Write a protein that binds this ligand. Structure first.
Ligand SMILES: [Cl-]
Length: 231
């Protein structure tokens, strides 16, 4: 029986509504049609990312190996939360257990926003810090840039030492993986900028349809971070 269960979470990747059942060594993502049992040892990284609208949060779980849904491979689990939603949790464990098990990181009875509770429980169980944005300031106080990638609109987050784009497909690129970056501008009167990244392995990523105001914030970031610009 589970330590706790988070019900009816909005998953973006893979898309659907899933319960997350929390066990000592794995989580169970349980939906109507599919389910996946995911050992914590397969979780590489955790991210908590504020949507630019200030009303939603992404929770991103990086996986290796990926989960398989037919021929589709998902290297990330992405959950989407309203900042508003609240939850009360009662861990299916006695009080003294939890203190020993989690080094005092959790208590038996907990209350808070759903996104914070999921992040806290995941943090404790995987024994990993949550990756958040650093000090990047975008346009109008957003910590991300709105852009298109592979013909889908999404959000690019400049992190302390990397970039992550959500959600279709998600992309995480560490600074140490980057060969160079470049900027290009088209002739449209809006959404005219492209930001391109080439990795050391030769892979290329283009984030396009970037507004000029956001391009300017991204430009300062890339320079502040001393990334190599190739014109
Ligand atoms: Cl523009």
């Amino acid at each position: 029986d589970a330590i706790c269960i988070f019900r009816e979470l909005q998953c973006l990747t893979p898309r659907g509504r899933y319960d997350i059942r929390i066990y000592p060594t794995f989580l169970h993502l349980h939906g109507k049609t599919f389910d996946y049992k995911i050992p914590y040892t397969t979780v590489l990284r955790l991210f908590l990312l504020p949507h630019k609208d200030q009303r939603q949060m992404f929770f991103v779980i990086s996986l290796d190996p990926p989960i398989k849904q037919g021929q589709t491979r998902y290297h990330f689990l992405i959950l989407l939360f309203s900042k508003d939603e609240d939850i009360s949790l009662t861990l299916n464990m006695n009080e003294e257990e939890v203190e020993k098990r989690f080094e005092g990181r959790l208590t038996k009875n907990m209350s808070g926003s759903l996104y914070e509770m999921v992040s806290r429980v995941m943090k404790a169980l995987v024994n990993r810090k949550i990756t958040v944005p650093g000090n990047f300031q975008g346009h109008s106080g957003a910590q991300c840039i709105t852009c298109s990638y592979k013909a889908s609109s999404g959000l690019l987050y400049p992190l302390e030492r990397g970039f992550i784009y959500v959600h279709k497909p998600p992309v995480h690129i560490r600074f140490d993986e980057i060969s160079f970056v470049n900027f290009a501008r088209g002739t449209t009167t809006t959404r005219s900028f492209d930001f391109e990244i080439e990795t050391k392995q030769g892979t290329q990523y283009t984030f396009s349809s970037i507004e000029r105001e956001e391009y300017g914030k991204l430009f300062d970031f890339v320079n502040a971070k001393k990334l190599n610009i190739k014109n």
